[PDB]
Amino acid sequence: MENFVRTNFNPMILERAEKTMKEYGENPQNEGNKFAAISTHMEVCFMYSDFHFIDLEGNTIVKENDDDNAMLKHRFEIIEGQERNIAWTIVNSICNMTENSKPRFLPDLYDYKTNKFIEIGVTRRKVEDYYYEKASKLKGENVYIHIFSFDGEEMATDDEYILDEESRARIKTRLFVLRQELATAGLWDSFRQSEK
Ligand SMILES: [Mn+2]
């Protein structure tokens, strides 16, 4: 619900979520649940990406300060939460500099280290169900798929995790916290059900 969302997410995320929402006619007002889902999905994207860089030796490394700067490239291109115009510019550009084929759907992320596109999903349902729902909708176009849930379970393509364990932890907790908060605010049930 809108008050809950506006209370529990930072302004950057709220800005982006509201934005992407003002494109299907829906508004946090009569669509609290969608607003929540988008907020969550977005936050997870940032959590996946922030503080992640690539070395001058090409290794991946996590750094608390976050600022880029010429010895450190950002590990990921955050595609989710940009304007579709910019998103596609980024996707198209990347496919240009490589042998990636332009994907049918916009991905959540791009990893410069593995040269993969990344779809991210968060679910209130199982994790298997969502994964196979996504995998199969995304068949062929090798995009790496990472699913999280609110019960702290998790499921990636072929079960390898290019994200460090700490960051995956951090995520799984956050989703957990959120689940509690929702429950104590009496919103968890309605939300859990509203999915699909
Ligand atoms: Mn997604």
Resolution (A): 2.7
Q: Would you say 67 is a known binding-site residue?
A: no
Q: Which two tokens stand for residue 189?
A: 């049930």
Ligand 1 midpoint to CA 71 (Å) = 30
Using a 10 angstrom Cβ sphere, with 0-12 exposed, 13-18 middle and 19 or more buried, the burial of residue 60 is middle
The reply to whether 80 belongs to the active site is yes
Task: State the catalytic residue, choosing from 80, 99, 129, 164.
Answer: 80
Q: Which architecture, in CATH terms, is 1-196?
A: 3-Layer(aba) Sandwich (3.40)
Q: Would you say 54 is a known binding-site residue?
A: no
Task: List the end-to-end C-alpha distance of the chain, in Å, as a whole number.
Answer: 17
Ligand 1 midpoint to CA 70 (Å) = 30
| DSSP for 26-37, written as a single string | --TTTTHHHHHH
Question: Between vectors from CA 21 to CA 15 and to CA 26, what angle results, nearest 5°?
Answer: 135
Q: Would you say 162 is a known binding-site residue?
A: no
Q: Buried (b) or exposed (e) across 64-77, using 16+ Cβ within 10 A?
A: eeeeeeeebbbbbb
